[PDB]
Design an enzyme around this catalytic site. Structure first.
Site, PDB file in Angstrom:
ATOM      1  N   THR A  57      -7.837   3.724 -21.894  1.00 20.78           N
ATOM      2  CA  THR A  57      -7.523   2.841 -20.780  1.00 20.78           C
ATOM      3  C   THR A  57      -7.008   1.530 -21.347  1.00 20.78           C
ATOM      4  OG1 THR A  57      -9.777   1.974 -20.682  1.00 20.78           O
ATOM      5  CG2 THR A  57      -9.274   3.832 -19.199  1.00 20.78           C
ATOM      6  N   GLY A  58      -6.431   0.725 -20.463  1.00 23.46           N
ATOM      7  CA  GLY A  58      -6.122  -0.667 -20.774  1.00 23.46           C
ATOM      8  C   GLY A  58      -5.187  -0.809 -21.956  1.00 23.46           C
ATOM      9  N   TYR A  59      -5.515  -1.771 -22.816  1.00 26.07           N
ATOM     10  CA  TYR A  59      -4.593  -2.144 -23.874  1.00 26.07           C
ATOM     11  C   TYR A  59      -4.494  -1.066 -24.955  1.00 26.07           C
ATOM     12  CZ  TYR A  59      -3.383  -6.945 -22.509  1.00 26.07           C
ATOM     13  OH  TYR A  59      -2.844  -8.069 -21.901  1.00 26.07           O
ATOM     14  N   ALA A 146     -13.668  -1.902 -26.134  1.00 24.03           N
ATOM     15  CA  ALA A 146     -14.398  -2.873 -25.331  1.00 24.03           C
ATOM     16  C   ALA A 146     -15.655  -2.188 -24.832  1.00 24.03           C
ATOM     17  CB  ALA A 146     -13.565  -3.406 -24.162  1.00 24.03           C
ATOM     18  N   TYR A 241     -14.952 -18.002 -24.218  1.00 24.62           N
ATOM     19  CA  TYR A 241     -14.116 -17.340 -25.216  1.00 24.62           C
ATOM     20  C   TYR A 241     -13.703 -18.233 -26.377  1.00 24.62           C
ATOM     21  CZ  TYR A 241     -13.844 -13.741 -21.680  1.00 24.62           C
ATOM     22  OH  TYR A 241     -14.173 -12.829 -20.706  1.00 24.62           O
TER      23      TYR A 241
HETATM   24  N1  LIG Z   1      -8.853  -7.083 -20.448  1.00 26.70           N
HETATM   25  C1  LIG Z   1      -8.259  -8.181 -20.900  1.00 26.70           C
HETATM   26  O1  LIG Z   1      -7.865  -9.091 -20.152  1.00 26.70           O
HETATM   27  C2  LIG Z   1      -8.034  -8.395 -22.361  1.00 26.70           C
HETATM   28  C3  LIG Z   1      -8.505  -7.525 -23.272  1.00 26.70           C
HETATM   29  N2  LIG Z   1      -8.246  -7.689 -24.646  1.00 26.70           N
HETATM   30  C4  LIG Z   1      -8.767  -6.757 -25.678  1.00 26.70           C
HETATM   31  O2  LIG Z   1      -8.195  -5.480 -25.498  1.00 26.70           O
HETATM   32  C5  LIG Z   1      -9.105  -4.479 -26.014  1.00 26.70           C
HETATM   33  C6  LIG Z   1      -9.344  -3.455 -24.942  1.00 26.70           C
HETATM   34  O3  LIG Z   1      -9.936  -4.207 -23.859  1.00 26.70           O
HETATM   35  P1  LIG Z   1      -9.646  -3.671 -22.398  1.00 26.70           P
HETATM   36  O4  LIG Z   1      -8.311  -3.048 -22.312  1.00 26.70           O
HETATM   37  O5  LIG Z   1      -9.976  -4.872 -21.522  1.00 26.70           O
HETATM   38  O6  LIG Z   1     -10.826  -2.627 -21.990  1.00 26.70           O
HETATM   39  P2  LIG Z   1     -10.847  -1.144 -21.477  1.00 26.70           P
HETATM   40  O7  LIG Z   1     -12.167  -1.232 -20.800  1.00 26.70           O
HETATM   41  O8  LIG Z   1      -9.625  -0.817 -20.690  1.00 26.70           O
HETATM   42  O9  LIG Z   1     -10.815  -0.017 -22.610  1.00 26.70           O
HETATM   43  C7  LIG Z   1     -11.845  -0.014 -23.618  1.00 26.70           C
HETATM   44  C8  LIG Z   1     -11.621   1.187 -24.504  1.00 26.70           C
HETATM   45  O10 LIG Z   1     -12.734   1.308 -25.424  1.00 26.70           O
HETATM   46  C9  LIG Z   1     -13.265   2.615 -25.317  1.00 26.70           C
HETATM   47  N3  LIG Z   1     -14.664   2.603 -25.697  1.00 26.70           N
HETATM   48  C10 LIG Z   1     -15.662   1.786 -25.225  1.00 26.70           C
HETATM   49  N4  LIG Z   1     -16.818   1.966 -25.809  1.00 26.70           N
HETATM   50  C11 LIG Z   1     -16.573   2.974 -26.735  1.00 26.70           C
HETATM   51  C12 LIG Z   1     -17.383   3.591 -27.707  1.00 26.70           C
HETATM   52  N5  LIG Z   1     -18.674   3.311 -27.884  1.00 26.70           N
HETATM   53  N6  LIG Z   1     -16.814   4.534 -28.495  1.00 26.70           N
HETATM   54  C13 LIG Z   1     -15.529   4.844 -28.300  1.00 26.70           C
HETATM   55  N7  LIG Z   1     -14.668   4.331 -27.415  1.00 26.70           N
HETATM   56  C14 LIG Z   1     -15.254   3.383 -26.662  1.00 26.70           C
HETATM   57  C15 LIG Z   1     -12.978   3.043 -23.893  1.00 26.70           C
HETATM   58  O11 LIG Z   1     -13.091   4.456 -23.798  1.00 26.70           O
HETATM   59  C16 LIG Z   1     -11.544   2.535 -23.776  1.00 26.70           C
HETATM   60  O12 LIG Z   1     -10.626   3.385 -24.460  1.00 26.70           O
HETATM   61  C17 LIG Z   1     -10.370  -5.230 -26.422  1.00 26.70           C
HETATM   62  O13 LIG Z   1     -10.356  -5.480 -27.821  1.00 26.70           O
HETATM   63  C18 LIG Z   1     -10.269  -6.526 -25.617  1.00 26.70           C
HETATM   64  O14 LIG Z   1     -10.967  -7.615 -26.209  1.00 26.70           O
HETATM   65  C19 LIG Z   1      -7.398  -8.751 -25.038  1.00 26.70           C
HETATM   66  C20 LIG Z   1      -6.928  -9.622 -24.168  1.00 26.70           C
HETATM   67  C21 LIG Z   1      -7.254  -9.608 -22.724  1.00 26.70           C
END
Ligand SMILES: NC(=O)C1=CN([C@@H]2O[C@H](COP(=O)(O)OP(=O)(O)OC[C@H]3O[C@@H](n4cnc5c(N)ncnc54)[C@H](O)[C@@H]3O)[C@@H](O)[C@H]2O)C=CC1
EC number: 1.3.1.9
Length: 405
Positions: A57-59, A146, A241
């Site tokens: 999902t996401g990034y 995340a 943050y």
């Molecule tokens: N959401 C936002 O606004 C922003 C997010 N980020 C960064 O982007 C990255 C992804 O964040 P998001 O896209 O927000 O979150 P997300 O919630 O969309 O995706 C998180 C991912 O991590 C995986 N995951 C979580 N726990 C796990 C585990 N124990 N083992 C394996 N896979 C696991 C999930 O399955 C998913 O693929 C992070 O490093 C976050 O800090 C950076 C800037 C802004």
């Protein structure tokens, strides 16, 4: 009767969480990101064998799509998602990854995925096994996890991250998306245990362990590259943050990468970096009340400038401009930046000006709360063009070459 095994799936929102996901909409949402990338065009000199940690999902999903459909890369993805079953939709990440495998194969691209705890040594070894069997080595590692919690792989200790300031308590304005009211609340300062736990969950250690497990097994190519995604934002969120518990994690990320970079620089001139991306709606957004308010304001302001973007737009630029191109955005610590349009001084001034004017009655006049709500539902496959939401679907969507950990 197939009706027994199929159902009509609708959003069910419990405690700021959507607990259902629609497989057809998730597939369409993935196809929309694929089509954005192919419409923008290929990216030259990108990696061809890519491991994405957090790929569903996401990034992380956006990086997987960018690498595969932008750079032509074979991709190995690691994630932690719930498959579907009769009467019980799986998570959006499960259906996203099913669609990714489907579309990857259509284009003759390798797509294998591993479902399990990426913080565990067992999952790292399964990942190494896959690379050895299939790819030999990987050129690029995206770290995009995340999680609110991390089970330490050696001690078994369960660490929980905290979202709190450091030093003094702070009053944070926010938006309750269930009641649709503007609501301030006071966050207490973090104990040292909370700080240390948050660094353990959101810091750079596990990223380092990944590279150290991979380099040891010979599955990182010469000239390999790795980046971890994070957010820094500006003043509105800075108590958390910049200076807060999460800021401590981003510091430890800045310092752990120095070590990871040293490990890969000696393995044939490799490198490690931190990539800073803009705030987007993610599935955790509604549970942190300041983010729905910030996003609703940011969306409106950036849409007025023509600069509103989501995950795939952000990550495609990161790849094209910084990870693979010659016009990067290095900051003073040596971080790659993709968030510069969010941090535009005039955007931030406008958001901060509106931050103090928004009330329960002018929410829809001062903000793009409409857009926030739409993009939130879209994550889970709801509200997608072309999808017939009246049609039965079988929630048990299967994934070929899915290794279950
Ligand atoms: N959401 C936002 O606004 C922003 C997010 N980020 C960064 O982007 C990255 C992804 O964040 P998001 O896209 O927000 O979150 P997300 O919630 O969309 O995706 C998180 C991912 O991590 C995986 N995951 C979580 N726990 C796990 C585990 N124990 N083992 C394996 N896979 C696991 C999930 O399955 C998913 O693929 C992070 O490093 C976050 O800090 C950076 C800037 C802004």
């Amino acid at each position: 009767g197939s009706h027994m095994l199929e159902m009509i799936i609708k959003p069910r929102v419990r405690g700021f969480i959507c607990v259902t996901a629609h497989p057809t909409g998730c597939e369409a949402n993935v196809k929309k990101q694929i089509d954005y990338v192919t419409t923008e065009g290929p990216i030259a000199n990108g990696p061809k064998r890519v491991l994405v940690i957090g790929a569903s999902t996401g990034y992380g999903l956006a990086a997987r799509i960018t690498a595969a459909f932008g750079c032509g890369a074979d991709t190995l993805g690691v994630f932690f998602e719930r498959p579907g079953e009769e009467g019980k939709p799986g998570t959006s990440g499960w259906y996203n990854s099913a669609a990714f495998h489907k579309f990857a194969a259509q284009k003759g691209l390798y797509a294998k995925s591993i479902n399990g705890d990426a913080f565990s040594d067992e999952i790292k070894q399964l990942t190494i096994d896959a690379i050895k069997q299939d790819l030999g080595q990987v050129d690029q590692v995206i770290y995009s996890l995340a999680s609110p919690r991390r089970t330490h792989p050696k001690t078994g200790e369960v660490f929980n991250s905290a979202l709190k300031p450091i030093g003094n308590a702070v009053n944070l304005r926010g938006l309750d998306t269930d009641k649709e009211v503007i609501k301030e609340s006071v966050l207490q300062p973090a104990t040292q245990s909370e700080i240390d736990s948050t660094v353990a969950v959101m810091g750079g250690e596990d990223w380092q362990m990944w590279i150290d497990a991979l380099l040891d097994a010979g599955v990182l190519a010469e000239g390999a590259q790795t980046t971890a995604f994070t957010y820094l934002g500006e003043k509105i969120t800075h108590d958390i943050y910049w200076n807060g518990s999460i800021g401590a994690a981003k510091k430890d990320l800045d310092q752990k990468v120095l070590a990871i970079r040293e490990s890969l620089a000696a393995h044939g001139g490799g490198d490690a970096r931190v990539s800073v991306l803009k705030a987007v709606v993610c599935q955790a957004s509604s549970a942190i009340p300041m983010m729905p308010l910030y996003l609703s304001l940011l969306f409106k302001v950036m849409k007025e400038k023509g600069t509103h973007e989501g995950c795939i737009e952000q990550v495609y630029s990161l790849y094209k401009d910084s990870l693979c191109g010659d016009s990067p955005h290095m900051d003073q610590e040596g971080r790659l930046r993709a968030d510069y349009k969010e941090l535009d001084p005039e955007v931030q001034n406008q958001v901060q000006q509106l931050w103090d004017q928004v009330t329960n009655d002018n929410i829809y006049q001062l903000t793009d709360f409409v857009g926030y709500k739409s993009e939130f539902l879209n994550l889970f496959g709801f509200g997608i063009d072309g999808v017939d939401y009246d049609a039965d679907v079988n929630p048990d969507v299967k994934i070929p070459n899915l290794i279950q950990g």
